[PDB]
C-alpha cells in the first residue's frame, strides 16, 4: 500500500479516458453509418474487430479497480435512448456517471453480480433499433466474463450470457434488420462466443448440439444472402468434425458449400488449411500440397504466432510424401526450437537410405507426434522411403538399366525392382517408360511444345485476374 | 602493439581446433605471449593449451607498474594542464587505451574508447578510434561491434577526409569473406590491389593477393575474368612469385582439368590453415568443381564419359556419382546416361529462358496486388 | 570464346553449325518493365500504409 497502493492512481486515470472514448467513437460512428449510407462495411467496424481480438482483450482482463472497467457495468446499467428526450436524458447520464466513476467508487460488481448488471442493460427501456449497440456492448463484456479464466460457476454464466445474446441475435434475425445488417458484426460475434463455447463443451460433454444449432444457423445464413456469413460459420462447423477423431471426413467430402467467394484475407487462409488437411488424408497429395502452399503464403502477417508454424508443420509432411523439401528452420523462433528438431531430423533420415534411424526417431519423438496429431506418417511415409530414391534416380539418369538400379537403391534384386518402378509410374511419380525387351528404363523425351502451345493456358488466367482488379477498382471507386 | 596483432588470432585458432596441429604453434606463441606483456586475453588459451606456469605473477607486477607509471602520468596531467581535445590529455589517455588492447582485455579498452570518442572534434582522430574498434572486433569476431562502427565509418565520418578509406575497402570485404559473401562483394572491392605497405591498416600484402585471387573465380567465369586478373599487371607480378597459385589460375583458364584438381587439392589443404575459415573448404571446393563442369559441358551437346575417363583424371564411376549428385541438386543442366554412356545436355532457348523469368516475376507481382487490393476496401 | 557458332559431339565425333535469333529485344524489354512495376507497387503500399 505505500509501494503498490500509491501506484494504484495511475492505472485508472488514462483508460478511464481514452479506452472509454474507444466505444464512444465506435458506438457513435457505427450509429452514424447505420442511419445514413446504410452500406456500412467501411467504418471502424473492422478496426474495432481487430481491436476486440487484440486490444481490449489485453487492455483489460479483470475489471480494473478504482473504476476503469469496474465502472462500465454501473455506467451502462441504465440505457434507454428511446425517444429524443430519452436520448438527451441518457446523454446527461453519459455525463453524470462518467464524472462519478472518474471521481469516486460506484457499484462494484464482485465478478458474480455481472449478470444482474447485464439484466438492466437488456432492461431499463432498451431499444431494438439500436441493435448494434445492444449486440456490441453485450458481447464486449463477455470477454472479461470468459478471460477471467477462473472457470468455476462462471462457465454456466458464460453459457447463460451467450444464450442471452444469441436469443437477441436470433430475434434480430427473426426481427428484420432494416438497413443495418448486423451479420457483418454478428459473424465474429458468433465466432468469439463459439470459440469458448467449444471450450466449455470440451470441459463438459460433446458439442454436436452446437453443430445442430450451427446447421440451422448456416441455413438462415446465405438463404437471406451472404455477407461473410457463409465464410465464418463453415470454418466453425468444419473444425469440430475435424477435432473429433472419429470418421468425419467423408462428411466433409460431400460438404458441397465450397463458395465463400471472399473472406477479407483472413478466413480464406485458414479455410485452405482445413481442406488441405482433408485432401491429404484421402491421399490426394498433389492438390493438397499446393493449397497448403497457398494457405501459408496468403496470411502470414503476424509475429511468430504458431498456426503459421502449424501450416508449415503439415506442409513438410506431404512434401516428404512426394520427395522434395526446402529450408525450414531459416525463420527460427524461441518456440520453433522445440518444433524444428523432430521434423528437420525426420527429413534428414528420409533423404538418406537409413531406416533404422527412421524407426529410432519415431520411437524417440513419437510423443511429440502425439501432440501434433500426426500418427499416420509411419504407415504412409514408409512408402516414400523407397520411392524417394527412384524419384531421385529417374530425374538424374536418362536411360538406365534395371540391373544397375538394384544396387543403387541397394535392393539387391532386379526382379522386384521392375515392380517398384511399375508402381511409381502407376502412381505418376515419374513419367518415364520401361523397355521390357533387354532391361532398359528410359526417361521422357526432350523439352516439348512448352515454348509454343502451353503459355496461353497460363496467360488466360492472368488477363482475367488483372482486369477484375481493374473492375473491382472502378466499381468501388466513388463514395462521394 | 596492434600492427602485427592478427597473427596471434591465427595461432589461437590453429592451435585449438586441430589438436594434431599442436607442435610448433605453442612454441612461438607462449614466448610471444610473455613478450609484449600479454597478460589478460590468454587465460582462455591457457585453459585449452598447456595447464599453467608461474610467470603470471611476474608479469602482473610488470603490468601493474606500467599501468601505475601511466596512471600517475595522466592524473597529474588532467589536474595541472587544462587544454583538451586532441591535446596531451588525449594521447596519454589513449595510451591507456592502447595499453588495454595490447595487454588487457577488450572491456577496459572499449570503455576507454567510448569515453575518448565523446571528447574529440578532429574526425581523423575519431576515425582512428573507429579503426581500433574494428580491429578488436575482428579479433573476437564480434558481429555486433562491426555492424555499428562500419556505419560510423560510412555515414558518421566519411563525408570529409579522403584516401584513408581505402584501408577500409580492404576491411569491409575482409568481413565479407568471413561471412558467406565469398561470391561478389569481396571480389568486387578487393579488385583495387594498389596498397602494398604491409601496415596495420594493410595487414599483409602477399596473402592479400592469395585472398583476392581465390575469391575472384566465383564472381565471374567468362564475363571477362581475364582482364582484371590475367591481363591485370600488378596482380601478375606477385603471382609470378608464387608458382602454385599461377598454376591454379592457368589450369582453369587454359582448360587443363587434370592438373587443375592437383592444384585444387593443394588449395583445399592449404585452406585448412586459415582463421576466417568456417565458410571455406566445404563450400569452396564443391562450388569450384561444378564451376569447372559447367564450362566443360559447354561447347558440347553429346559427351561420352569415357572421354572424361582420361582427359579429366581417372575414375569412371567417380564422375558418374558426382554428376548424379549435381544433376539431382537442381544444378549442372544436363542428363547423365547409362548404357550408351553419353552425357546428353539440355539448355533453355530465347523463348524458354524469357518465359521462365516472366512466369515468376508475373506471379510475384500478382500475389503482391492480391494483398494490396484487399488492404484497401475494408 | 564465342568466335564461332557451333557445337560438338563425342558420340559421333561431329561438328555442327547453326544460327540464332536476334529477336529477343521484345522479351528483354518486357520483363524490365516488371522491375519498374515492382517499384511502383512497393511505393503505393507504402503510401497506403501511411494513411488508411
Amino acid at each position: 500500500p505505500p509501494g503498490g497502493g500509491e501506484q494504484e492512481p495511475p492505472p485508472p486515470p488514462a483508460p478511464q479516458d481514452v479506452e472509454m472514448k474507444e466505444e464512444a467513437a465506435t458506438g457513435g460512428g457505427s450509429t452514424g453509418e447505420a442511419d445514413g449510407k446504410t452500406a456500412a462495411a467501411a467504418a471502424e467496424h473492422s478496426q474495432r474487430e481487430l481491436d476486440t481480438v487484440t486490444l481490449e482483450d489485453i487492455k483489460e482482463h479483470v475489471k480494473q479497480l478504482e473504476k476503469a472497467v469496474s465502472g462500465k457495468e454501473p455506467r451502462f446499467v441504465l440505457r434507454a435512448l428511446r425517444m429524443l428526450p430519452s436520448t438527451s436524458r441518457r446523454l446527461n447520464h453519459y455525463v453524470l456517471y462518467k464524472a462519478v466513476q472518474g471521481f469516486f467508487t460506484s457499484n462494484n460488481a464482485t465478478r458474480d453480480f455481472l449478470l444482474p448488471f447485464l439484466e438492466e442493460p437488456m432492461d431499463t427501456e432498451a431499444d431494438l433499433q439500436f441493435r448494434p449497440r445492444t449486440g456490441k456492448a453485450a458481447s464486449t463484456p463477455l470477454l472479461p466474463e470468459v478471460e477471467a479464466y477462473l472457470q468455476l460457476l462462471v462457465v454456466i454464466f458464460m453459457m447463460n450470457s451467450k444464450r442471452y445474446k444469441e436469443a437477441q441475435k436470433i430475434s434480430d434475425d427473426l426481427m428484420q434488420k432494416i438497413s443495418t445488417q448486423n451479420r457483418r458484426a454478428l459473424d465474429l460475434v458468433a465466432a468469439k462466443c463459439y470459440y469458448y463455447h467449444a471450450r466449455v463443451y470440451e470441459f463438459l460433454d460433446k458439442l454436436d448440439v452446437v453443430r445442430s444449432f450451427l446447421h440451422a444457423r448456416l441455413r438462415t445464413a446465405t438463404l437471406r444472402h451472404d455477407a461473410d456469413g457463409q465464410a465464418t460459420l463453415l470454418n466453425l462447423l468444419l473444425r469440430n468434425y475435424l477435432h473429433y477423431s472419429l470418421y468425419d471426413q467423408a462428411e466433409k467430402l460431400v460438404s458441397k458449400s465450397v463458395f465463400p467467394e471472399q473472406a477479407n484475407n483472413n478466413e480464406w487462409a485458414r479455410y485452405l488449411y482445413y481442406t488441405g488437411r482433408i485432401k491429404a488424408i484421402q491421399l490426394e497429395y498433389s492438390e493438397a500440397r499446393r493449397t497448403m502452399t497457398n494457405a501459408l503464403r496468403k496470411a502470414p502477417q503476424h509475429t511468430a504466432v504458431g498456426f503459421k508454424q502449424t501450416v508449415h508443420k503439415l506442409l513438410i509432411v506431404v512434401e516428404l510424401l512426394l520427395g522434395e523439401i526446402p529450408d525450414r528452420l531459416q525463420f527460427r523462433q524461441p518456440s520453433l526450437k522445440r518444433s524444428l528438431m523432430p521434423y528437420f531430423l525426420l527429413t534428414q533420415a528420409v533423404r538418406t537410405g537409413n531406416l533404422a534411424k527412421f524407426n529410432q526417431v519415431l520411437d524417440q519423438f513419437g510423443e511429440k507426434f502425439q501432440a501434433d496429431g500426426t500418427y499416420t506418417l509411419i504407415i504412409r511415409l514408409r512408402h516414400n522411403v523407397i520411392k524417394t530414391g527412384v524419384r531421385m534416380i529417374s530425374l538424374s539418369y536418362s536411360r538406365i538399366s534395371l540391373a544397375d538400379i538394384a544396387q543403387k537403391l541397394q535392393l539387391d534384386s532386379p526382379e522386384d525392382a521392375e515392380f517398384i518402378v511399375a508402381k511409381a509410374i502407376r502412381d505418376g511419380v515419374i513419367e518415364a517408360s520401361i523397355n521390357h525387351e533387354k532391361g532398359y528404363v528410359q526417361s521422357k523425351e526432350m523439352i516439348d511444345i512448352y515454348s509454343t502451345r502451353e503459355p496461353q493456358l497460363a496467360f488466360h488466367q492472368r488477363i482475367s485476374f488483372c482486369l477484375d482488379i481493374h473492375n473491382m477498382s472502378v466499381k468501388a471507386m466513388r463514395f462521394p | 602493439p596492434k600492427n602485427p596483432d592478427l597473427r596471434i588470432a591465427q595461432l589461437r585458432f590453429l592451435l585449438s581446433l586441430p589438436e594434431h596441429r599442436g607442435d610448433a604453434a605453442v612454441r612461438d606463441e607462449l614466448m610471444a605471449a610473455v613478450r609484449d606483456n600479454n597478460m589478460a586475453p590468454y587465460y582462455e588459451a591457457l585453459c585449452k593449451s598447456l595447464d599453467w606456469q608461474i610467470d603470471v605473477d611476474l608479469l602482473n607486477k610488470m603490468k601493474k607498474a606500467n599501468e601505475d607509471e601511466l596512471k600517475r602520468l595522466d592524473e597529474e596531467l588532467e589536474d595541472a594542464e587544462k587544454n583538451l581535445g586532441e591535446s596531451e590529455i588525449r594521447d596519454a589517455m589513449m595510451a591507456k587505451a592502447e595499453y588495454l588492447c595490447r595487454i588487457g582485455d577488450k572491456e577496459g579498452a572499449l570503455t576507454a574508447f567510448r569515453k575518448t570518442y565523446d571528447k574529440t572534434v578532429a574526425l581523423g582522430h575519431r576515425l582512428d578510434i573507429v579503426f581500433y574498434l574494428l580491429r578488436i572486433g575482428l579479433f573476437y569476431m564480434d558481429n555486433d561491434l562491426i555492424t555499428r562502427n562500419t556505419e560510423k565509418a560510412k555515414s558518421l565520418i566519411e563525408e570529409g577526409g579522403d584516401w584513408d578509406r581505402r584501408n577500409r575497402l580492404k576491411v569491409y570485404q575482409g568481413l565479407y569473406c568471413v561471412a558467406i559473401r565469398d561470391f561478389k562483394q569481396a571480389a568486387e572491392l578487393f579488385l583495387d590491389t594498389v596498397s602494398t605497405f604491409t601496415s596495420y591498416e594493410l595487414m599483409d600484402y602477399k596473402t592479400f593477393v592469395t585472398y583476392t585471387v581465390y575469391v575472384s573465380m566465383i564472381a565471374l567465369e567468362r564475363p571477362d575474368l581475364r582482364e582484371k586478373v590475367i591481363k591485370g599487371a600488378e596482380i601478375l607480378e606477385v603471382l609470378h612469385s608464387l608458382p602454385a597459385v599461377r598454376q591454379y589460375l592457368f589450369s582453369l583458364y587454359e582448360c587443363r582439368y587434370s592438373v587443375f584438381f592437383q592444384s585444387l587439392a593443394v588449395v583445399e589443404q592449404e585452406m585448412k590453415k586459415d582463421w576466417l575459415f568456417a565458410p571455406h573448404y566445404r563450400y569452396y571446393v564443391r562450388e569450384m568443381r561444378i564451376h569447372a563442369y559447367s564450362q566443360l559441358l559447354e561447347s558440347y551437346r553429346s559427351l561420352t564419359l569415357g572421354y572424361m575417363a582420361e582427359a579429366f583424371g581417372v575414375g569412371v564411376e567417380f564422375i558418374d556419382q558426382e554428376l548424379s549428385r549435381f544433376i539431382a541438386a537442381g544444378r549442372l543442366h544436363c542428363k547423365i546416361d547409362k548404357v550408351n554412356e553419353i552425357v546428353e545436355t539440355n539448355r533453355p532457348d530465347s523463348k524458354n529462358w524469357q518465359y521462365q523469368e516472366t512466369i515468376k516475376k508475373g506471379d510475384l507481382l500478382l500475389n503482391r496486388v492480391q494483398k494490396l487490393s484487399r488492404v484497401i476496401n475494408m | 570464346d564465342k568466335k564461332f557458332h557451333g557445337i560438338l559431339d563425342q558420340g559421333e565425333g561431329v561438328l555442327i553449325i547453326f544460327d540464332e535469333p536476334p529477336v529477343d529485344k521484345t522479351y528483354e524489354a518486357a520483363l524490365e518493365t516488371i522491375q519498374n512495376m515492382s517499384k511502383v507497387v512497393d511505393s503505393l503500399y507504402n503510401k497506403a500504409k501511411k494513411l488508411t
Binding site: L467, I469, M477 | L372 | -
Partner: peptide, 30 residues
C-alpha cells in the same frame, strides 16, 4: 503482362487518391 498489369495499377491509383479525398474531406466537413 503489359496491358493487363498497367491498366489495373493505374486504376488502383484512382482508388487511393479517391479514398484519401473521401475521408479527408469528410473529417474536415465538421
Amino acid at each position: 503482362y503489359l496491358a493487363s498489369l498497367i491498366r489495373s495499377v493505374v486504376a488502383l491509383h484512382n482508388l487511393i487518391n479517391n479514398k484519401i479525398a473521401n475521408r479527408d474531406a469528410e473529417k474536415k466537413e465538421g
